[PDB]
Design a protein around this ligand. Sequence first.
Ligand SMILES: [Mg+2]
Ligand SMILES: [Mg+2]
Ligand SMILES: [Mg+2]
Ligand SMILES: [Mg+2]
Ligand SMILES: [Mg+2]
Ligand SMILES: [Mg+2]
Ligand SMILES: [Mg+2]
Ligand SMILES: [Mg+2]
Ligand SMILES: [Mg+2]
Ligand SMILES: [Mg+2]
Ligand SMILES: [Mg+2]
Ligand SMILES: [Mg+2]
Ligand SMILES: [Mg+2]
Ligand SMILES: [Mg+2]
Ligand SMILES: [Mg+2]
Ligand SMILES: [Mg+2]
Ligand SMILES: [Mg+2]
Ligand SMILES: [Mg+2]
Lengths: 73, 115, 88
Amino acid sequence: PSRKAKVKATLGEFDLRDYRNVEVLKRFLSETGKILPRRRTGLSAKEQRILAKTIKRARILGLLPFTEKLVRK
Amino acid sequence: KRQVASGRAYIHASYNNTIVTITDPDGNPITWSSGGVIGYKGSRKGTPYAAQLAALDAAKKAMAYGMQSVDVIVRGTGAGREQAIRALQASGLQVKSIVDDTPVPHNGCRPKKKF
Amino acid sequence: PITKEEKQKVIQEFARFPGDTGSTEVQVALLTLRINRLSEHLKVHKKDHHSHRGLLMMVGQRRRLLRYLQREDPERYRALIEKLGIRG
RNA sequence: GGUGAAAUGCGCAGAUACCGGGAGGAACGCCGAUGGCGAAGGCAGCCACCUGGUCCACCCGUGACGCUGAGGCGCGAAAGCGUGGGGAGCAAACCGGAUUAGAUACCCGGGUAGUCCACGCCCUAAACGAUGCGCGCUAGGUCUCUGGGUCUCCUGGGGGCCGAAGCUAACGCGUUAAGCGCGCCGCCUGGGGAGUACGGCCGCAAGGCUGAAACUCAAAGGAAUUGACGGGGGCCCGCACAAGCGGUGGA
Ligand SMILES: [Mg+2]
Ligand SMILES: [Mg+2]
Ligand SMILES: [Mg+2]
Ligand SMILES: [Mg+2]
Ligand SMILES: [Mg+2]
Ligand SMILES: [Mg+2]
Ligand SMILES: [Mg+2]
Ligand SMILES: [Mg+2]
Ligand SMILES: [Mg+2]
Ligand SMILES: [Mg+2]
Ligand SMILES: [Mg+2]
Ligand SMILES: [Mg+2]
Ligand SMILES: [Mg+2]
Ligand SMILES: [Mg+2]
Ligand SMILES: [Mg+2]
Ligand SMILES: [Mg+2]
Ligand SMILES: [Mg+2]
Ligand SMILES: [Mg+2]
């Protein structure tokens, strides 16, 4: 069911526009650098259109990765 | 020639072939092999039993240089992709970590007609 | 673009009493200002056809308030067409 | 490497795979959604700047100023031309290999135009909701984007699906009307000939716009129904095939 836990509840509050909040914005990527599908995140219609141009910001400034490779795990 | 403890396994699985070049912690070609070197001539080469075979004859040239440990890397989705991966755990070689890193554009080149 | 206070200017500099946020004249102006930051913005960005639109719905919208004034009083017109110096 | 299988092709002047550095062009993965915006063609990597449209709120302002528009003016994907740059990858024409009875194709390995930037042309399209443009009226239900509020819910603007009334040839439309009325526009008037000819008009050109007739046929059409049929699928059965025994075809 993909019914693990969306990342909206696994945190206190925060701002979606503070690019270098990388503790949080690591849990909005995958085991690739891919911005988590809206179903995983559980973000609003506004919210993940914001968190979109955020991790596109906090990428150019190196902080958050463009892609990874893969752990067979 | 020389001796090497830890070395890393590169696997390139196409459709018309599957290729294993094994190296050292830098990425330097110790021994390499694909199905077409095993004896396979045409469409023969892509079979999952060819991938099992390259990841033998390549991992055999590599114990010839005394190979102990391997980490694996794989490039593609192809016939018997993981059949070689297994063909290495089954050759007598510690499989460290196993990684996939497929060439993935972010949309640059228009592919050929045949998409 | 424009901000409140420069707007303020044209507004009160034009209004026929104080708090006439919009009479006719006001608007015949406000556009004149907007058209004109637009004539320029375009006079270099020649390939912005898209905004050329908005210009013309404004070139236009003016030209009616124009005639409206030509009709319901031609003096307050004579005075509004010198005070902005249009036609051409 | 490539395919159904293969050869042209590239490699013992060292290819592929493999690490590190470098240049150059073209696009922008995940977020990307039945989602947004725009008048339309059309538009998504990230930043700033110059701007256009638009919605919500308070109802403060002038006070019918409003609608539509023949012609004129401007915008208009893709290919196409013109001068000059650019050319990674794709790739008409073209060069080969394979398939086939033949293959000027489907499949494979190269290849100029061209796609890319500019600046001027070209000004067509299944340019498509195939529904020109405003306003007023007529059950609602859920979904979805976006505004405002005394946010259990109320109320604006959008995009979708199902349905009242009613329309409709039927399909289907269905408060995003193809429902009920008002204004204005352009357009149709049987199929072929034909988007041709004649003439004017536009462009450098390729061509476009406007646009007939003579003659010939009783049709050309639209939805919809029962079947038949598919190298369309879904589900069953027969010694239909397979698993087994024995023969014919030969004498
Ligand atoms: Mg490199
Ligand atoms: Mg479109
Ligand atoms: Mg009032
Ligand atoms: Mg009054
Ligand atoms: Mg009009
Ligand atoms: Mg073009
Ligand atoms: Mg040139
Ligand atoms: Mg070709
Ligand atoms: Mg050209
Ligand atoms: Mg151009
Ligand atoms: Mg054009
Ligand atoms: Mg035509
Ligand atoms: Mg239309
Ligand atoms: Mg609605
Ligand atoms: Mg009914
Ligand atoms: Mg319906
Ligand atoms: Mg006729
Ligand atoms: Mg039998």
